[PDB]
């Protein structure tokens, strides 16, 4: 009688409740009779409302519970309905944008409408507030896809409310037919969404094939209701408009709207780089425009005439062109953005106004610069002062354009591109959070710009002066003379600057990591965590930290002895670990709190485990739990997390209700005996993996078996094996520790309740379970429970008997009501307490009909949305089906729900006339609280973990993921779990929540567990557009460098490696042919260069040292946050494992598949770069080039060094056998992406080739020009021509007739590698650049050919064949070189065992059973392993012979092949006996040609 039995005791048992359940029920019933809601959906939402009303009034008064629920749903500043109303109903979106900007920089009007709205809300009676929330929930509970479009539902709510309040409805006598709201209103909107993606093909539904710019999605549908212009587009069937009807007559005609003639695309996606320019224009302005000024200032030789350090007016006016560059990036950004947006919507007339202001600013920068340059008398103060002034106009332009957001440019004079309410409403940072965001980004760019000047630019001052002034003394080609080879130093310079332009971008990410690592270690030190202390200090203080931070002991109870309560909670944790078979009996006893007889007889005493004492008493080093154990992990994280700031909890009865929502489609529920016991079966594979867990399991099995002394025993092995594998049972069993934790806390903190029962221990467990049923709900969404196979159906029924309180929501098809129509779909809810019908299926508690099949998109989010109407409580924890939790973490739930900042706060009237928006303290609610996750059994994955504390403080966390909790009333009123309209990562998934004003938090003291499993389409999303062009700079820099700046960093690293190869092949080609001066160290600029006539290119060659260091640091800096994170928690040695797991990540898979899986990914590019790297080292050797050898050897030889059983003799040559069988058997967006980049690379190699044959420094005349351009044509087209020539034999004449053509292509391609080698007169260095050029030239030839035939018909299939013969030889020759490289190590005896020991010693040593072959097949194995062994040794004898052939052919004293040709073919073979050292004391005949 002292403990109420009613379902909602905090409301019903309180006498201060303004309205009873009877009145609240009559309101829900009246609304259903009036608007035709489903009766079963009304019962669901009536139950949902009462739980919200009972979880709220659990911690406040019932009057404040109803008032705060009305504010959060209808009329508060946190209500999405108030935001939509002030934007779409009152045209006040621009006023909201003005005050957002004014409030963001802090640490008839809008104000009159706000005061008028608060006074209308304040006069509502409690019954009117119930009717408002009930109407919204009833509309929300039958929306089922309009839940994804929040603002479409606000419009439907207002149409329904206006109709409801009218005499047209109050005077109506008959009720609306049941299901009328869904049939007439919701279903047509669903049919629009479905017909955008699906088509009817003779009766079924199959996806349409359309680009994403033809599909009107959820966002394009939602945004119509953001503006009064959009609502003015809603048109009825008869032709009229919806807004032409009185307010109360519009709901009744929402079924006559032709939604196809209304909805339209609001944001079209385009080419990826067009979005990067607009969305991240502030990133390009600073790097691109500061780079210009850095290099214009440090390159006086580009504007000095007849090179003279004076005449500074030219130096200042040349830097001042960085303001013209910044003003031009903004023009291009505005032009790109003008193509994403429809031309008459939401703004975009302000886009044309902005373009003209940016054209004025750009003219102001350009104009006076033209005056300075073109009106100078070759020290004119009329131009020396202009140049100085225009340098600061340039600087001020750069600062303005890289600070101020693009969308908020010139908006002070529809002024915004998108509505502010829903797109530009980010929560500002205040106080210490704000100053840390400033300090991070000031430090990142003060350190970046400081050392990018001294190391990237000042080091280049002499290379720029030298390479831009020297002219080569070459002879050149026959076709153009010496006009291309005398500008080679300038071509080398232009490539060097372009390579340093990309290093300018890699530099910023280098400093983002360095600064964030220091700030994430100084934050831990300041917060007191500061983990360098031994674990003895962490564990000794644990007993006191359990009393404070877990036990809610702020003295409601009368000061019980703390040791009693800690023991009751510490022991339950350990017993939980012991029943999980993680602790042995000798471990547990040393860890428990033990009752001991007192000094006084007939008494008991509590004493702490030595674990809490022996750590302090370090005389001994006993083991309480095993090394590297899971109990070692969980206890060490538990004690470590309780050393951090944790909010103090509420009593359990004051706790909010929450829900765990889990989507399930096809995952395994339980392991069945078939798949555990029948190359090693599952059950015996687990014993090998979890040995000590199993023996403790059987040891308990022995006790249980001998207790009864099998169906009981066969189950506990299915359960034991399921709890070690990724199953749904393991997740459900792990997250029912919330029910166990809530019961334990309720019992430990309420001794009076327990003592009240006093021996009625069975009746107490009813009381503890009644409370845990009230505060925790587990909801699993089983999408296909209606189509479960009987073994799966039996698995699900086992869940509902082990856990009666678990609820399962499922889709329930139903025959069509009339023949030749669509089946009816329902959402149904069952649980363990449901009556079990005759057919073995439980009768559903609720059964709500949908408009149609809800699964229209990418799966998970549609599943979560159908089951979302059955969630209860204030918070939802999203959970994935392959997770699990622990009791010691589930004990911290009351302090994780306190991160939403609604539990221990005062309640004020949200409609009080005194307050103004600016002084309200609840304007930005916490939307998401994220938590750490443990992966049991990547760069950015563990980048975020170390930075998560700093990124959450400065607003940089946008994670709508699976391990985290959400504010249910905030999120479900604003679109829900996701959008279901695209393989988006969850790293940036809740930014709709952040765009709409919610904050996203991160707690470091909670950690669940989860099992493991190009730019992307993320860059084309509108959320990047809204975030990029509207965030303030400090918060834009955190947004860019967290997710998208990481993906661009990877791209820039690759581009920087391909531009170094093009630069190196030209810088080594220039150093090979030049006599370079002795590089005197510590010498002035105009000092004497020792060999008179030399080239001073040693400074330019040393640039390779500096670039190599830069890209070496850039590689190894991505590991610093990885090592520091593990070094600071594990402490000494586990950093090494994560360092090597990260580094290594970067039967026997055959070469036929392993090579083909990485051929177009790393092998092809890395084999072309290795040829270019090979030329670089032989042409001019430098030590730093070794790192590019190691980094390219690994890139190619990684997949073939970790393949198990790759390196043994016998299996090696059998893999070659199937490799050969694989070879024979089997019978403007493209141009601007990889066609021009492919031509530039061929041109850059062509320049390097022709210069190395330019005879630099040979005393020649006009007829000593070589025709090295012809050598390219002869060695590029001729192998292609003969590839086509044989295909005309096949048509003139299917493996024998094809392998002859396949064999011919290999022969000719190798033959012309030999033809080039002799055209260069047997010069190995000149051949390498010759062959590289031809490979790149054929790639360009096919690349333009492929796009030409893939935008005649008989050749449209022929061209794809000649492209393939040359392609085939590329695979044949490249494949063997990988194989031939395996030769020196297979001949090492005992290499397979030697290699495979570390293949399993460093990793867990998984064992595959050694195969046993027939003694008849073995005789065939011996033959065939020695059959193709004699072929691999012969292809190696042909590949080798092609190398020692021309190499030995140097014994050709006779002058050179073809001494008597004349004309376009004279000197087709490079001359010899020519010494290109024309430097020295000789000063006559300066003219080498």
Ligand X SMILES: CCCCCCCCCCC(CCCCCCCCCC)(CO[C@@H]1O[C@H](CO)[C@@H](O[C@H]2O[C@H](CO)[C@@H](O)[C@H](O)[C@H]2O)[C@H](O)[C@H]1O)CO[C@@H]1O[C@H](CO)[C@@H](O[C@H]2O[C@H](CO)[C@@H](O)[C@H](O)[C@H]2O)[C@H](O)[C@H]1O
Ligand Y SMILES: *[C@@H]1O[C@H](CO)[C@@H](O[C@@H]2O[C@H](CO)[C@@H](O)[C@H](O)[C@H]2NC(C)=O)[C@H](O)[C@H]1NC(C)=O
Binding site for ligand POV (CB under 6 A): 1160, 1164, 1167-1168, 1170-1171, 1174, 1309-1310, 1313, 1331, 1335, 1338-1339, 1346, 1366-1367, 1369-1370, 1373-1374, 1377, 1443
Q: Which is nearer to ligand POV, 348 or 1195 (CB)?
A: 1195
- Say which entry of ligand X, ligand ERG, ligand POV, none residue 1366 contacts (CB below 5 to 8 A, set by partner kind): ligand POV
DSSP secondary structure letters along 1097-1162: -HHHHTHHHHHHHHHHHHHHGGGHHHHHHHHHHT-SSHHHHHHHHHHHH-----HHHHHHHSIIII
Q: Tell me the sheet residues that pair with 966.
A: 876, 928
Are the C-beta atoms of residues 531 and 524 closer than 8 Å to each other? Answer: yes
In the complex, minimum distance from the CB of residue 1474 to ligand Y, in angstroms, rounded to a whole number: 14
Using CB under 6 A as the binding rule, the residues of this chain from 617 to 656 that contact ligand X are: none
Instruction: State the Cα–Cα distance between residues 1199 and 1382, nearest whole angstrom.
Output: 13
Is 310 a binding residue for ligand ERG by CB under 6 A? The answer is: no
User: Which of the residues 1070 through 1099 are near ligand Y (CB under 6 A)?
Assistant: 1075, 1078, 1090-1092
According to the binding rule CB under 6 A, does residue 442 interact with ligand X?
A: yes
Sign of CA dihedral 81, 84, 90, 92: positive
Out of ligand X, ligand POV, ligand Y, none, which partner does residue 1477 contact, by CB within 5 to 8 A per kind? Answer: ligand Y
The residue written with tokens 């002879």 in the block is 475
CB of 350: closest distance to ligand X in angstroms?
12
Q: 9 or 1032, CB closer to ligand X?
A: 1032
Query: Which H/E stretch holds residue 549?
Result: helix 542-549
How far lies 1107's CA from each of 191, 341, 455, 1063, 1193, in Å?
59, 42, 10, 11, 19
The CB-of-1376 to ligand POV minimum distance in angstroms stands at 9
* CA-closest candidate to residue 317, choices 364, 366, 284: 366
Member of 119, 385, 396, 446 binding ligand X (CB under 6 A): 446
φ/ψ of 542, rounded to 5, equals -60, -45
Does 1383 engage in binding with ligand X (CB under 6 A)? no
Q: Which is nearer to ligand Y, 1037 or 1077 (CB)?
A: 1077
Q: Which of 21, 277, 764, 1094 contacts ligand X by CB under 6 A?
A: 277
Which residues in the 398-417 window bind ligand ERG by CB under 6 A?
398-399, 402-403
User: Which C-beta is closer to ligand POV: that of 872 or that of 1339?
Assistant: 1339
Contacts with ligand Y: how many residues (CB under 6 A)?
9
Closest to 952 in 3D by CA, of 971, 928, 976 = 928
Runs of H (alpha helix) within 375-487: 381-403, 420-423, 432-454, 461-467
Query: Is residue 1165 near ligand X by the rule CB under 6 A?
Result: yes
1241 binds ligand ERG (CB under 6 A): yes
Structure tokens at 761: 């221990």
CB of 1021 to ligand ERG, least distance (A): 18
Residue 1480 interacts with which of ligand POV, ligand Y, ligand ERG, none, CB < 5 to 8 Å by class = ligand Y
Shortest distance in whole angstroms from residue 149 CB to ligand ERG: 33
**Radius of gyration of the chain measured on its C-alpha atoms:** 38
- Closest approach, Cβ 1093 to ligand Y, in A, equals 8
Question: Is residue 1232 involved in binding ligand ERG (CB under 6 A)?
Answer: yes
For residue 1189, the minimal CB distance to ligand POV (Å) is 9
Residues numbered 1244 to 1273 that lie near ligand ERG (CB under 6 A) are 1244, 1247
1181, two tokens: 């050797």
Tokens of 372: 């300075």
* Interaction of residue 1033 with ligand X, rule CB under 6 A: yes
Q: In 3D, which of 1153, 1468, 1177 has the Cα closest to residue 1320? A: 1468
Q: Is 405 a residue that touches ligand X (CB under 6 A)? A: yes
Number of residues counted as binding ligand ERG (CB under 6 A): 74
Can you spell out the DSSP letters for 171-234? T--SPPPTTHIIIIIIHHHHHHHHHHHEEEEBTEEEE----TTT---HHHHHGGGGSHHHHTT-
DSSP one-letter code for 269: -
Q: Is 404 in the site for ligand X (CB under 6 A)?
A: yes
- Give the angle 271-276-282 at the CA atoms, nearest 5°: 155
Our CB check for ligand X shows the closer of 1032 and 1330 to be 1032
CB of 1441 to ligand POV, least distance (A): 12
In the complex with ligand Y, the residue whose CB is nearer, 1190 or 1483, is 1483
Residue found under tokens 């023991």 = 567
- If you ran DSSP here, which 8-state letter would residue 842 be given? B
Greatest CA separation for the chain? 123
- Judge contact between 858 and 979, C-beta under 8 A: no
Rank residues 961 and 1091 by Cβ distance to ligand Y and give the closer one.
Answer: 1091
Q: Which does 1247 bind (CB under 5 to 8 A by kind): ligand X, ligand ERG, ligand POV, none?
A: ligand ERG
> In this chain, which stretch among 219-227, 589-597, 685-693, 1439-1447 interacts with ligand ERG, using CB under 6 A?
1439-1447
Within residues 1453-1482, the interface with ligand Y by CB under 6 A covers 1477, 1479-1481
Q: How far is the CB of 307 from ligand Y (least distance, A)?
A: 25
> Which residues in the 1056-1075 window bind ligand Y by CB under 6 A?
1075
Among 342, 1237, 1458, 1480, interactor with ligand X by CB under 6 A: 1237
Distances (CA, A) of 390 to 143, 324, 327, 371, 396: 60, 11, 14, 11, 10
CB of 1366 to ligand POV, least distance (A): 5
Among 251, 340, 501, 846, binds ligand ERG (CB under 6 A): 501
* Residue nearest to ligand ERG according to CB distances in the complex: 494
Instruction: Considering the complex, state which of residue 108 and residue 1475 has its C-beta at the smaller distance from ligand Y.
Output: 1475
Q: In terms of Cα–Cα distance, which of 1411, 942, 1371 is closest to 1158?
A: 1371
How would you classify the pairing of strands 846-849 and 824-831?
Answer: antiparallel
CA of 632: how far to CAs of 562, 588, 623, 670, 1023, in Å? Answer: 25, 13, 10, 27, 43
Element (H, E) at 357: helix 350-374
Q: Of the two residues 1331 and 1399, which places its CB atom closer to ligand POV in the complex? A: 1331
Residue 411 contact among ligand POV, ligand X, ligand Y, none, beta carbon within 5 to 8 Å by kind: ligand X
Of the residues 368, 925, 1028, 1032, which one makes contact with ligand X according to CB under 6 A: 1032
CB of 1134 to ligand Y, least distance (A): 55
Q: Does 340 bind ligand X (CB under 6 A)?
A: no
| Separation between Cα atoms, residue 1185 and residue 1197, nearest integer Å | 18
Q: What is residue 1076's three-state secondary structure?
A: strand
Q: Which residue's CB is nearer to ligand X, number 289 or number 1283?
A: 289
CA 907 to chain centre: 39
- CB contact at 8 A, 809 and 800: no
| Residues sharing a CB contact under 8 Å with residue 55, sequence separation 6 or more, in sequence order | 10, 656, 657, 775, 873, 874
The reply on whether position 1287 binds ligand X by CB under 6 A is no
Pick what 1091 binds: ligand Y, ligand X, ligand ERG, none; C-beta below 5 to 8 Å, kind-dependent. ligand Y
721 near ligand ERG, judged by CB under 6 A: no
- 771 CB neighbour count, 10 Å cutoff: 23
Structure tokens at 492: 């080398």
1321 binds ligand ERG (CB under 6 A): no
Q: How many angstroms separate the CA atoms of 1153 and 1195, rounded?
A: 17
Do the bridges between strand 926-936 and strand 965-967 make them parallel or antiparallel, or are there none, so unpaired?
antiparallel
Using CB under 6 A, list all residues that contact ligand Y. Answer: 1075, 1078, 1090-1092, 1477, 1479-1481
Binding site for ligand X (CB under 6 A): 101, 105-106, 271-273, 277, 284, 286, 399, 402-405, 408, 411, 438, 441-442, 445-446, 1014-1015, 1032-1034, 1051, 1054-1055, 1165, 1232-1234, 1236-1237
């Amino acid at each position: 009688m002292a403990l109420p039995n009613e379902p909602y005791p905090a409301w019903t048992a309180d006498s201060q409740s303004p309205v009873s359940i009877e009145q609240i029920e009559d309101i829900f019933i009246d609304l259903t009779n009036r608007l035709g809601f489903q009766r079963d959906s009304m019962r669901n939402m009536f139950d949902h409302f009462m739980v919200l009303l009972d979880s709220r009034s659990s911690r406040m008064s019932p009057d404040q519970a109803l008032l705060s629920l009305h504010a959060d749903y209808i009329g508060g500043d946190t209500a999405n309905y108030k935001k939509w109303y002030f934007a779409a109903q009152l045209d006040m979106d621009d006023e909201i944008g003005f005050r957002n900007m004014s409030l963001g920089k802090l640490s008839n009007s809008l104000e009159a409408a706000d005061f008028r709205w608060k006074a209308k809300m304040n006069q509502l009676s409690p019954l009117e507030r119930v009717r408002h929330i009930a109407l919204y929930l009833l509309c929300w509970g039958e929306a089922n896809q309009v839940r994804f479009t929040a603002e479409c539902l606000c419009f439907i709510y207002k149409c329904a409310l206006d109709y409801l309040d009218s005499p047209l409805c109050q005077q109506r006598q008959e009720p609306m037919p049941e299901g009328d709201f869904l049939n007439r209103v919701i279903t047509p909107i669903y049919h629009f969404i479905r017909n955008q993606v699906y088509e009817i093909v003779d009766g079924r539904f199959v996806k349409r094939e359309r680009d994403h710019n033809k599909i009107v999605g959820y966002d394009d549908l939602n945004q119509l209701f953001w503006y009064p212009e959009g609502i003015a587009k809603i048109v009825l069937e008869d032709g009229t408009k919806l807004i032409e009807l009185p307010l109360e007559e519009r709901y009744l005609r929402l079924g006559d709207v032709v939604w196809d003639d209304v909805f339209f695309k609001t944001y079209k996606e385009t080419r990826t780089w067009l979005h990067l320019v607009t969305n991240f224009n502030r990133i390009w302005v600073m790097h691109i425009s500061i780079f210009w000024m850095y290099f214009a200032y440090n390159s006086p030789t580009f504007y000095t005439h007849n090179y003279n350090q004076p005449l500074a007016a030219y130096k200042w006016a040349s830097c001042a062109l960085g303001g013209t560059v910044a003003s031009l990036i903004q023009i291009v950004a505005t032009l790109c953005e003008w193509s994403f947006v429809p031309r008459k919507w939401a703004g975009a007339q302000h886009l044309s106004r902005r373009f003209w202001f940016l054209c004025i600013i750009f003219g102001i920068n350009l104009g006076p610069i033209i005056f300075v340059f073109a009106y100078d008398k070759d020290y004119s103060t009329a131009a020396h002062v202009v140049a100085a002034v225009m340098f600061f106009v340039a600087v001020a332009t750069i600062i303005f354009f890289s600070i101020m957001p693009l969308g908020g440019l010139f908006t002070s004079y529809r002024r915004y591109v998108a509505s502010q309410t829903f797109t530009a409403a980010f929560a500002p940072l205040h106080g210490l959070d704000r100053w840390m965001s400033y300090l991070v980004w000031v430090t990142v760019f003060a350190a970046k710009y400081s050392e990018s000047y001294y190391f990237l630019v000042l080091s280049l001052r002499d290379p720029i002066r030298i390479l831009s002034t020297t002219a080569m003394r070459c002879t050149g080609e026959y076709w153009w003379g010496a006009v291309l080879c005398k500008v080679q130093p300038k071509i080398v310079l232009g490539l060097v600057i372009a390579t340093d332009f990309i290093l300018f971008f890699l530099d910023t990410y280098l400093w983002y990591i360095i600064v964030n690592t220091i700030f994430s270690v100084g934050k831990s030190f300041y917060l007191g965590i500061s983990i360098l202390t031994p674990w003895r200090n962490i564990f000794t203080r644990l007993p006191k930290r359990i009393y404070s931070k877990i036990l809610a002991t702020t003295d409601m109870e009368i000061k019980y002895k703390p040791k009693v309560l800690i023991s009751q909670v510490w022991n339950a944790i350990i017993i939980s670990m012991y029943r999980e078979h993680l602790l042995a009996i000798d471990h547990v006893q040393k860890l428990l709190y033990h009752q001991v007889p007192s000094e006084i007889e007939g008494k008991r005493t509590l004493r702490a485990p030595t674990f809490f004492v022996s750590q302090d008493d370090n005389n001994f080093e006993t083991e309480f739990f095993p090394r590297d154990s899971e109990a070692e992990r969980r206890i060490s994280f538990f004690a470590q997390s309780l050393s951090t700031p944790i909010p103090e909890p509420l009593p359990v009865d004051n706790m909010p209700t929450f829900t765990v929502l889990t989507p399930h489609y096809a995952e395994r529920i339980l392991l069945s005996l078939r798949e555990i016991i029948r190359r090693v079966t599952l059950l015996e594979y687990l014993k090998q993996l979890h040995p000590v867990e199993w023996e403790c399991f059987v040891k308990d099995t022995k006790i249980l078996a001998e207790e009864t002394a099998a169906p009981e025993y066969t189950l506990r092995t299915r359960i034991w094996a399921s709890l070690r594998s990724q199953t749904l049972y393991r997740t459900i069993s792990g997250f029912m520790n919330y029910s166990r934790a809530i019961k334990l806390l309720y019992r430990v903190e309420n001794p009076e309740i327990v003592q009240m029962f006093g021996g009625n221990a069975e009746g107490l467990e009813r009381e503890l379970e009644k409370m845990a049923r009230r505060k925790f709900k587990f909801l699993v969404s089983m999408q296909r429970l209606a189509k479960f196979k009987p073994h799966e159906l039996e698995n699900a029924e086992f869940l509902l008997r082990a856990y009666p309180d678990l609820q399962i929501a499922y889709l329930d098809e139903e025959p069509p009501l009339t023949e030749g129509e669509e089946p009816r779909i329902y959402s149904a809810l069952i649980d363990g307490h449901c009556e079990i019908l005759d057919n073995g299926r439980r009768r559903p508690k609720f059964r709500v009909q949908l408009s149609g099949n809800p699964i229209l998109g990418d799966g998970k989010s549609d599943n979560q949305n159908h089951a979302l109407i059955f969630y209860r409580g204030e918070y939802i924890q999203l959970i994935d089906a392959n997770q699990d939790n622990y009791l010691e973490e589930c004990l911290k739930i009351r302090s994780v729900l306190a991160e939403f900042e609604e539990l221990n706060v005062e309640q004020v009237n949200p409609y009080a006339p005194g307050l103004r928006y600016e002084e309200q303290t609840t304007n930005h609610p916490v939307a998401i609280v994220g938590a750490r996750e443990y992966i049991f059994s990547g760069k950015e994955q563990t980048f975020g973990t170390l930075f998560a504390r700093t990124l959450s403080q400065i607003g940089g966390k946008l994670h709508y993921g699976h391990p985290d909790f959400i504010n249910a009333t905030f999120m479900t009123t604003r679109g829900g779990v996701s959008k279901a309209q695209h393989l988006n990562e969850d790293i940036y998934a809740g930014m709709n929540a952040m765009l709409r004003g919610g904050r996203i938090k991160h707690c470091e003291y909670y950690q669940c567990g989860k099992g493991r499993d190009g730019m992307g389409e993320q860059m084309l999303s509108r959320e990047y557009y809204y975030l990029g062009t509207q965030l303030p700079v400090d918060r834009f820099l955190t947004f860019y460098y967290a997710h998208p700046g990481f993906h661009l960093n990877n791209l820039f690293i690759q581009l920087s490696l391909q531009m170094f190869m093009l630069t190196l092949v030209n810088l080594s080609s220039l150093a090979h042919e030049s006599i370079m001066c002795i590089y005197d160290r510590n010498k002035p600029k105009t000092d004497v260069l020792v060999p008179i006539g030399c080239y001073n290119f040693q400074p330019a060659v040393d640039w390779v040292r500096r670039y190599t260091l830069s890209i070496f640091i850039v590689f190894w800096i991505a590991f610093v946050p990885i090592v520091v994170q593990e070094l600071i928690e594990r402490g000494l040695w586990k950093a090494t494992q994560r360092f090597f797991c990260h580094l290594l990540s970067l039967s026997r898979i055959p070469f036929s598949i392993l090579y083909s899986r990485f051929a177009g990914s790393a092998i092809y590019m890395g084999a072309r770069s290795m040829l270019m790297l090979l030329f670089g080292t032989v042409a001019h050797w430098q030590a730093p080039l070794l790192w590019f050898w190691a980094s390219l050897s690994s890139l190619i030889f990684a997949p073939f060094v970790f393949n198990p059983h790759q390196f043994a003799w016998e299996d090696f040559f059998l893999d070659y056998r199937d490799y050969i069988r694989w070879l024979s058997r089997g019978n403007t967006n493209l141009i601007m992406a990889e066609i021009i980049p492919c031509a530039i690379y061929a041109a850059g190699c062509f320049i390097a080739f022709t210069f190395i044959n330019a005879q630099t420094g040979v005393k020649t005349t006009d007829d000593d020009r070589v025709n090295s351009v012809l050598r390219i044509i002869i060695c590029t087209l001729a192998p292609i021509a003969v590839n086509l020539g044989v295909l005309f034999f096949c048509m003139g004449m299917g493996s024998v007739m094809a392998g002859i053509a396949h064999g011919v292509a290999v022969i000719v391609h190798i033959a012309f590698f030999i033809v080039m080698w002799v055209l260069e007169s047997f010069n190995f260095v000149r051949m390498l650049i010759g062959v590289v050029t031809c490979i790149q030239c054929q790639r360009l030839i096919f690349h333009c050919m492929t796009a030409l035939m893939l935008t005649t018909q008989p050749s449209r299939e022929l061209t794809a064949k000649v492209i393939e013969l040359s392609e085939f030889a590329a695979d044949f020759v490249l494949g063997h070189v990988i194989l031939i490289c395996q030769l020196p190590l297979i001949i090492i005896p005992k290499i397979d065992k030697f290699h495979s020991i570390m293949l399993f010693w460093l990793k867990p040593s998984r064992q595959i059973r050694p195969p046993i072959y027939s003694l008849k097949q073995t005789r065939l194995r011996k033959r065939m392993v020695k059959k193709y062994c004699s072929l691999y040794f012969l292809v190696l004898a042909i590949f080798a012979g092609c190398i020692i052939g021309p190499a030995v052919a140097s014994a050709k004293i006779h002058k050179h092949i073809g001494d008597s040709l004349d004309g376009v073919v004279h000197n087709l073979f490079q001359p010899i006996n020519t010494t290109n050292n024309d430097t020295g004391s000789q000063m006559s005949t300066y003219q080498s040609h």
